[PDB]
Amino acid sequence: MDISKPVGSEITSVDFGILTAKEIRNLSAKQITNPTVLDNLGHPVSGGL
Amino acid sequence: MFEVPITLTNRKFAQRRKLKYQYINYISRRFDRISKQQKKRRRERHWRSVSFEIWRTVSSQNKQPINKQKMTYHNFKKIEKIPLRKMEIPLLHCTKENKLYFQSISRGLEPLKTSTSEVRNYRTRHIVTLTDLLHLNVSRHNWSLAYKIFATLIRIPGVQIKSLWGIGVEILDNLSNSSSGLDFLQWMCQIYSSKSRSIVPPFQTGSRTHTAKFAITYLWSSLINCQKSMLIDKISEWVLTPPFMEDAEVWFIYASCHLLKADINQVIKHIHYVRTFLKICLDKGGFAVPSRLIENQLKSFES
Amino acid sequence: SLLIRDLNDDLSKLQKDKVSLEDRRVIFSRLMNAFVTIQNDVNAFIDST
Ligand SMILES: [Mg+2]
């Protein structure tokens, strides 16, 4: 926290609710489908976690 | 009198290969006419296809009927007469013994003396005797001696490792000490699975398309190191690890790991699992039990 | 998930317009199995309880 980095926007309330499968699919960056996490060279498996 | 595990002593054998494949080119060229350099040898050798578990061959059907005589005396000597003089030109550049070899193979006579039998250099002849004694001792069940031969051999700076099956069956039958056949094999695969011609038939190979013998044999033989058990999720963990998709045999290895782990709803998931991999093993060139037998074991399980 | 996507693949390769009834019982057996264990894994996370 830095007195020379002021913030203009302010959160005033929070609403609780439920994520729909439509929202999720739209916002998602990648659909994950592979149980395997790494390969033999320690790189991320594509479509993995 | 046995194969030597060394690159063959050179010059004359290579220039003879020249004369041979060059004359071969001239004769077969004029032959296709009448039916109408390391690199010359290279194109020449190039344009040509390069109750028990029998990896069966390709038998006789769908092959084309016949031919009736192409080659009388007069017609052959027609094809032969000219390319032999073209050969008369560079024969004048090669050595007299080489020229004699060209004359005799071109008459059709086959040379008395092997490449080994005429070979000549101290170190290589000694390596020849070394490797020989290796192969002999391994044949003689003399795993101790043979092991000494192998270690002394691999020491030498000239030997890349064809010799690995020698050490696989060697340490295998040795049982004596040293980090064993499996360790060697998985070492072979770990060092020679990454970018990190004369000598090469299939039993030693490169990892673009199938490296065969050693890989499949450590695979099966490791599943038999589970026959020691009843390790599995290890073996199929590193059969899970590699992508070299044209296998299916590792699909049957996989489904066999699930049948062995299936020997409560967990066991159910293992049985549904093997049920899956048997069909994704119908993916490729089939390994088949009647497989209703596989399923019948799976119903003995469904009990 | 992958495993159910396979059950669903073999399930469609019925007609069974021909096709002898009982496999109906076994397909259901496999489906119940899948639903139960995914539902368990979700429960365990929200929930190991
Ligand atoms: Mg061929």
From Swiss-Prot, chain B:
Note in the entry: Present with 476 molecules/cell in log phase SD medium.
InterPro entries linked to this entry: RNA_pol_I-specific_init_factor, TIF_Rrn11, TIF_Rrn11_budding_yeast
MF annotations from Gene Ontology: RNA polymerase I core promoter sequence-specific DNA binding; RNA polymerase I general transcription initiation factor activity; TBP-class protein binding
Descriptive protein name: RNA polymerase I-specific transcription initiation factor RRN11
GO biological process: nucleolar large rRNA transcription by RNA polymerase I
Keyword Transcription regulation: yes
Keywords: Nucleus, Transcription, Transcription regulation
Functional summary from the UniProt entry: Acts as a component of the core factor (CF) complex which is essential for the initiation of rDNA transcription by RNA polymerase I. After binding of UAF (upstream activation factor) to an upstream element of the promoter, CF is recruited in a SPT15/TBP-dependent manner to form a preinitiation complex.
Cellular component terms per the entry's GO annotation: nucleolus; nucleus; RNA polymerase I core factor complex
Quaternary structure and partners: Component of the core factor (CF) complex, which consists of RRN6, RRN7 and RRN11. The CF heterotrimer may further dimerize to form a hexamer. RRN11 interacts with RRN6, RRN7 and SPT15.
Recorded name of the encoding gene: RRN11
Subcellular location, record wording: Nucleus, Nucleolus
Organism: Saccharomyces cerevisiae (strain ATCC 204508 / S288c) (Baker's yeast)
Protein's UniProt keywords contain Signal: no
UniProtKB/Swiss-Prot annotation, chain C:
Note from the entry: Present with 2840 molecules/cell in log phase SD medium.
Residue numbers of the full-length protein present here: 393 to 441 of 1664
Function: DNA-dependent RNA polymerases catalyze the transcription of DNA into RNA using the four ribonucleoside triphosphates as substrates. Component of RNA polymerase I (Pol I) which synthesizes ribosomal RNA precursors. Besides, RNA polymerase I has intrinsic RNA cleavage activity. RPA190 and RPA135 both contribute to the polymerase catalytic activity and together form the Pol I active center. In addition, subunit RPA12 contributes a catalytic zinc ribbon that is required for RNA cleavage by Pol I.
Protein name: DNA-directed RNA polymerase I subunit RPA190
Sections of the chain in a coiled coil: none
Assembly and oligomerization: Component of the RNA polymerase I (Pol I) complex consisting of 14 subunits: RPA135, RPA190, RPC40, RPA14, RPB5, RPO26, RPA43, RPB8, RPA12, RPB10, RPC19, RPC10, RPA49 and RPA34. The complex is composed of a horseshoe-shaped core containing ten subunits (RPA135, RPA190, RPB5, RPO26, RPB8, RPB10, RPC10, RPA12, RPC19 and RPC40) where RPA135 and RPA190 form the DNA-binding cleft. Outside of the core, RPA14 and RPA43 form the stalk that mediates interactions with transcription initiation factors and newly synthesized RNA.
Protein family according to the UniProt entry: Belongs to the RNA polymerase beta' chain family.
Location in the cell: Nucleus, Nucleolus
